[PDB]
Structures are given as structure tokens and as C-alpha cells.
UniProtKB/Swiss-Prot annotation:
Role according to the record: Cysteine protease that cleaves viral polyprotein and specific host proteins. It is responsible for the autocatalytic cleavage between the P1 and P2 regions, which is the first cleavage occurring in the polyprotein. Also cleaves the host translation initiation factor EIF4G1, in order to shut down the capped cellular mRNA translation. Inhibits the host nucleus-cytoplasm protein and RNA trafficking by cleaving host members of the nuclear pores. Counteracts stress granule formation probably by antagonizing its assembly or promoting its dissassembly.
Sites where the protein binds Zn(2+) 1: 50, 52, 110, 112
SUBUNIT field: Homodimer.
Substrates-to-products reaction catalysed: Selective cleavage of Tyr-|-Gly bond in the picornavirus polyprotein
Interval of the full protein contained in this chain: 869 to 1008 of 2193
Source domain of life: Viruses
Stated name of the protein: Protease 2A
Organism: Coxsackievirus A16 (strain G-10)
Active site: 15 (for protease 2a activity), 33 (for protease 2a activity), 104 (for protease 2a activity)
Coiled-coil regions listed in the entry: none
Amino acid sequence: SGAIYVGNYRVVNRHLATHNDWANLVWEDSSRDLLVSSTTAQGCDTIARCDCQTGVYYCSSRRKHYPVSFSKPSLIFVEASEYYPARYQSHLMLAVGHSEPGDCGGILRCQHGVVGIVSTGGNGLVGFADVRDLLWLDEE
Ligand SMILES: CN(C)S(=O)(=O)c1cccnc1
Ligand SMILES: [Zn+2]
């Protein structure tokens, strides 16, 4: 579990979005595993605006943050998990690391701020849903 809190926006994994998220929907994309809802209180996070390929992510199934190198966002085949069938996922970054289903929502960060959230795992990789292209998160 986990979210990004930027301005008056909550960014969550689409598959973990709540009824209240859907009732306060700003934007969602199944292909990216992302949903954004509106919040009453302003949040503490800053979104990265960059093309970094090094950062640190939180792994809840290890209670640990890990430094990783990751691929630039692309359109990648993902094998079946407990929460999605085998399918193509867009705007996905991969690194070598540990990721189980419950790790979804952990933050990946670089020197510029939040890069994305854990969205995939298995076979010794961790996959992150990028948010750095979503410039509208910084305003309005
Ligand atoms: C839609 N994209 C912006 S993406 O990140 O899924 C992508 C797709 C193809 C090549 N490189 C990146
Ligand atoms: Zn960066």
C-alpha cells in the first residue's frame, strides 16, 4: 500500500483505489495502473521533473529502502500477478530488486523528488508506475 500526496491530489495504484477515491476522481488509466483523487488537506510530496535513472525505493515486504538503477518508462509485458492478468502496462520502469503484491504504492525517489510508485514485481524485478510526465499534478 501507499500513495503520493501532492497539492490537493492523492496518487494511488488503480487496483488499490477505494470507493472514496472513485467518488472524488480526478483521472485514471488502467494501462498505467494509476488513479488520482482530490484531497481536502494539502500534501508533503514534490514530483520529480527529470529523466533520472537512479533513485531509492521503499520495499514494505523488507521494511527497507534500496538504491536502484531503473529503465526509462516504456510499454512492457507483465506476467500475471494476484491483482492483474498477464498484460501490457504503459509508462513502466524496471529495476533489479524485491517486489511482492503488497509492496505496491511504495515510493521511488530521486534528487528531484518522487519519480513513481511500485506497481509490478516477480522474477527478481520491481516495476514502478512513472508520474514525472503528469505536469498537471503541480498546479490547479
Ligand atoms: C506511452 N509512453 C509515453 S510509454 O512511456 O509507455 C512508451 C511507449 C513507447 C516507447 N517508450 C515509452
Ligand atoms: Zn531526478
